[PDB]
Amino acid sequence: RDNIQGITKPAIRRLARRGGVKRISGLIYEETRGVLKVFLENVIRDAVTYTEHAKRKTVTAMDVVYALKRQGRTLYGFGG
Amino acid sequence: RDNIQGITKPAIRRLARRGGVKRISGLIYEETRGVLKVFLENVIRDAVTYTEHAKRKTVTAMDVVYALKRQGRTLYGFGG
Amino acid sequence: ELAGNAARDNKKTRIIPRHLQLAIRNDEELNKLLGRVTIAQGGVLPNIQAVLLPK
Amino acid sequence: ELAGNAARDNKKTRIIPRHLQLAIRNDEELNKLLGRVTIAQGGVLPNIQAVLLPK
Amino acid sequence: KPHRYRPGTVALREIRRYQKSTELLIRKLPFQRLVREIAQDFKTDLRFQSSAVMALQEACEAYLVGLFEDTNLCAIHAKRVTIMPKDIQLARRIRGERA
Amino acid sequence: KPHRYRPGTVALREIRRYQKSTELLIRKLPFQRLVREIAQDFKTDLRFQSSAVMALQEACEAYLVGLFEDTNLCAIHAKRVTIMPKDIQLARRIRGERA
DNA sequence: GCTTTTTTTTTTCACAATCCCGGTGCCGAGGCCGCTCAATTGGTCGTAGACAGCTCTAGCACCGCTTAAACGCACGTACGGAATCCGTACGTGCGTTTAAGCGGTGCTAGAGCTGTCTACGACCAATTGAGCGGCCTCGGCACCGGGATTGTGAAAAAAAAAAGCTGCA
DNA sequence: GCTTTTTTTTTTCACAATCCCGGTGCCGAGGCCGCTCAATTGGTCGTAGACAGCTCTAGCACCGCTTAAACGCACGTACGGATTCCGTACGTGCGTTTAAGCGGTGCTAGAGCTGTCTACGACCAATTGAGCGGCCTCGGCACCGGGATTGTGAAAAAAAAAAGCTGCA
Numbered sequence: 184r185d186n187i188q189g190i191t192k193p194a195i196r197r198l199a200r201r202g203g204v205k206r207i208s209g210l211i212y213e214e215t216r217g218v219l220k221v222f223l224e225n226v227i228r229d230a231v232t233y234t235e236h237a238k239r240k241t242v243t244a245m246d247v248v249y250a251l252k253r254q255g256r257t258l259y260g261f262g263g
Numbered sequence: 264r265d266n267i268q269g270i271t272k273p274a275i276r277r278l279a280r281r282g283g284v285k286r287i288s289g290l291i292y293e294e295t296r297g298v299l300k301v302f303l304e305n306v307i308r309d310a311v312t313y314t315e316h317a318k319r320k321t322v323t324a325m326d327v328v329y330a331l332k333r334q335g336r337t338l339y340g341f342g343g
Numbered sequence: 344e345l346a347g348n349a350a351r352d353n354k355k356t357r358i359i360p361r362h363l364q365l366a367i368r369n370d371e372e373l374n375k376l377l378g379r380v381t382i383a384q385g386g387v388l389p390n391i392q393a394v395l396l397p398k
Numbered sequence: 399e400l401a402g403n404a405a406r407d408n409k410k411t412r413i414i415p416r417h418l419q420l421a422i423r424n425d426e427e428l429n430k431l432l433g434r435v436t437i438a439q440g441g442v443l444p445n446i447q448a449v450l451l452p453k
Numbered sequence: 454k455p456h457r458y459r460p461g462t463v464a465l466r467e468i469r470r471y472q473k474s475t476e477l478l479i480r481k482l483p484f485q486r487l488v489r490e491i492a493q494d495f496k497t498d499l500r501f502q503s504s505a506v507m508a509l510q511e512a513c514e515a516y517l518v519g520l521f522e523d524t525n526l527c528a529i530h531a532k533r534v535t536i537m538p539k540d541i542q543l544a545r546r547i548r549g550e551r552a
Numbered sequence: 553k554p555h556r557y558r559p560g561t562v563a564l565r566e567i568r569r570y571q572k573s574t575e576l577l578i579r580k581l582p583f584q585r586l587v588r589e590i591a592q593d594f595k596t597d598l599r600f601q602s603s604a605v606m607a608l609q610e611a612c613e614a615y616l617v618g619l620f621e622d623t624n625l626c627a628i629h630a631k632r633v634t635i636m637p638k639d640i641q642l643a644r645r646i647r648g649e650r651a
Numbered sequence: 652g653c654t655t656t657t658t659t660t661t662t663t664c665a666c667a668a669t670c671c672c673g674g675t676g677c678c679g680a681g682g683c684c685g686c687t688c689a690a691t692t693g694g695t696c697g698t699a700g701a702c703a704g705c706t707c708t709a710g711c712a713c714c715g716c717t718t719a720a721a722c723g724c725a726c727g728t729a730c731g732g733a734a735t736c737c738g739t740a741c742g743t744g745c746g747t748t749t750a751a752g753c754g755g756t757g758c759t760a761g762a763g764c765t766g767t768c769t770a771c772g773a774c775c776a777a778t779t780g781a782g783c784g785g786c787c788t789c790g791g792c793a794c795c796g797g798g799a800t801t802g803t804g805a806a807a808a809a810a811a812a813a814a815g816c817t818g819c820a
Numbered sequence: 821g822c823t824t825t826t827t828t829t830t831t832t833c834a835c836a837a838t839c840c841c842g843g844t845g846c847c848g849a850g851g852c853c854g855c856t857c858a859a860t861t862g863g864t865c866g867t868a869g870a871c872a873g874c875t876c877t878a879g880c881a882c883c884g885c886t887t888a889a890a891c892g893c894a895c896g897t898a899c900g901g902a903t904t905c906c907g908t909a910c911g912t913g914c915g916t917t918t919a920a921g922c923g924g925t926g927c928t929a930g931a932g933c934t935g936t937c938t939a940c941g942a943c944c945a946a947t948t949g950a951g952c953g954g955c956c957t958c959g960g961c962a963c964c965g966g967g968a969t970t971g972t973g974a975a976a977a978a979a980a981a982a983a984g985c986t987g988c989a
């Protein structure tokens with residue numbers, strides 16, 4: 184239905200485990216989906232802008248890397 | 264001299280009031296002086312760095328504006 | 344435009360730092376644009392958290 | 399130097415992202431230099447809040 | 454003699470496990486389709502280098518893990534062990550993500 | 553009888569007063585001496601433009617006012633009305649200022 | 652049923668504080684002025700990028716199999732939040748103490764500008780070797796298996812506190 | 821001092837996680853090619869900027885008085901935090917269902933390159949107005965005093981409410 188639901192409750196539980204969380208309200212799984220969608224929205228918007236500016240129909244890794252740098256979340260290992 | 268005490272209790276309470284604070288622990292005042300001092304050391308060190316690079320013996324407002332911009336704390340109205 | 348309105352609403356002819364600040368922080372978009380910017384002699388928007396108010 | 403020592407500690411002759419991540423985040427100064435950087439396939443430092451453990 | 458672990462014990466094992474590992478924790482395909490779905494809302498018929506979608510995931514997972522660490526402290530700060538939506542909201546408020 | 557406001561009522565007045573105003577709330581001289589004092593650790597016999605000290609003050613107070621907002625939210629989050637050192641500390645930990 | 656008792660609830664009633672008003676007088680917004688410096692106009696040369704035309708990379712569609720992860724659900728423990736309770740930390744307001752802020756004059760470090768000159772980078776061409784994709788091979792790391800070893804809990808029976816019982820000082 | 825509940829502690833079993841084997845196998849580090857183009861060498865030439873030398877801004881410090889602000893105490897309410905208590909939201913551990921992932925094939929959009937051409941920007945020099953610093957008016961804003969309005973809080977009414985008293989079909 185929504186691809187957002189493809190980010191499942193068990194995947195969310197794993198992420199919060201890596202972030203040291205022990206116990207998790209039921210409500211969080213939607214809340215998380217909200218945040219994550221807004222995160223992607225913002226990063227993808229700027230990446231595609233770089234794509235549209237490069238006159239390409241293909242979003243490169245570099246497009247994302249420049250988008251993630253602009254958003255203050257610099258990313259190493261993907262052609263930085 | 265020993266001027267950090269010159270950041271008085273009432274002056275800390277005043278700032279906190281502008282920050283919407285209603286009730287204030289007795290321990291806040293020394294804690295705030297620590298933070299304020301840490302804040303100043305960092306801003307000033309970079310200011311002074313700029314001053315020294317310009318071979319000057321007098322800190323300018325630009326030195327401070329440029330330092331503040333370096334701390335992600337941009338200031339408008341002092342030639343910025 | 345927005346800083347003038349804050350002045351007129353203060354019954355003043357000339358824009359001051361406060362007027363700019365009010366104008367900027369009361370507009371969602373400008374507040375975003377200047378989120379990491381400090382406007383000197385601006386002060387803050389009046390905003391007391393509801394739980395701190397008497398009953 | 400440090401990531402190599404992290405590889406030596408895991409009986410690996412090859413540095414991988416994790417080894418760099420462990421080098422950078424256990425050293426105070428490097429951690430601060432790259433505070434706003436994400437290291438791909440780096441993971442996080444093993445760290446569980448004290449109140450979450452049993453007695 | 455059916456064995457049972459107390460509530461929290463497996464959670465504590467999972468934390469320990471996942472902190473030790475570096476492998477991406479969202480299933481890659483549902484993620485890829487979500488990236489493609491959101492990308493449509495800005496431009497139609499968009500192609501993605503596989504590495505581009507991998508960057509986006511590596512990025513998404515680090516940020517969320519990090520946010521969970523900050524959220525977890527907000528819960529603990531309010532004398533709780535259970536994270537809740539308001540913990541995430543305070544965290545993002547203080548980080549300067551939302552107003 | 554001699555008149556008396558209840559605890560909390562003047563605190564709210566003081567808020568309304570200072571949030572309305574824009575003037576600096578630290579006394580200018582004790583601040584200036586503090587600026588000169590810290591500046592000695594890095595380089596001795598330093599002069600300061602007057603505007604540089606005002607800039608430094610404008611910046612300090614905006615930082616601290618702001619920090620008190622975040623702090624006040626952290627106290628509220630733990631169902632308290634009183635700010636404490638741990639509130640400031642958590643706020644700063646989330647902002648990334650402190651480890 | 653109704654009277655009595657009691658907390659709420661609600662209204663009067665003083666008093667502090669904050670808001671508007673006009674009156675005053677001072678100082679920087681505002682605009683005018685005359686000069687200077689940077690923008691424009693109108694030359695020429697040069698190439699940086701638009702464009703076509705080609706290659707061929709890697710991004711998409713699609714299928715079929717093997718599990719592994721996702722999904723419900725039965726069950727109960729441990730958490731959250733509500734409620735009550737209580738000592739004292741913090742707010743409020745008082746007299747007393749401090750020193751900031753005010754204006755002023757007096758002094759001169761040094762910020763800042765101008766003119767000189769020279770060592771240092773730019774620009775160019777001929778040289779030429781370090782760094783380039785492109786390949787090809789072997790050992791370092793994934794993986795499985797199994798069987799210690801060590802760790803880390805749960806549970807179950809024991810070894811101590813909690814409250815409750817007196818009656819008793 | 822005893823009994824009567826619940827704690828807390830101590831002492832067996834269980835289950836995963838791990839080290840240490842040993843063996844196996846896969847591909848990507850690792851390093852060797854053979855150009856190649858991008859860094860070195862050499863040389864000439866401009867001007868960016870070190871330095872002197874000067875002006876004259878603004879930074880500093882110092883006195884002296886007024887008064888607001890800070891300082892320290894007494895007093896007391898409401899706050900933070902400790903406890904007890906209850907309901908069910910979560911974590912656990914089964915079975916059941918599903919589609920992620922793997923490996924493979926098949927197409928072709930479109931990334932990304934080479935080469936050709938020229939429109940569009942750097943460059944220069946003469947021109948010359950927009951914009952600067954300097955300076956002088958004059959009306960908005962800072963400030964004051966005084967009255968009008970707002971808002972809090974204590975203690976005194978109105979009302980509601982909640983128990984004790986009487987009769988009661």
Ligand SMILES: [Ca+2]
Pocket residue numbers: none
């Ligand atoms: Ca070209």
Ligand SMILES: [Ca+2]
Pocket residue numbers: none
């Ligand atoms: Ca190579």
Ligand SMILES: [Ca+2]
Pocket residue numbers: none
């Ligand atoms: Ca309470």
Ligand SMILES: [Ca+2]
Pocket residue numbers: none
């Ligand atoms: Ca002017």
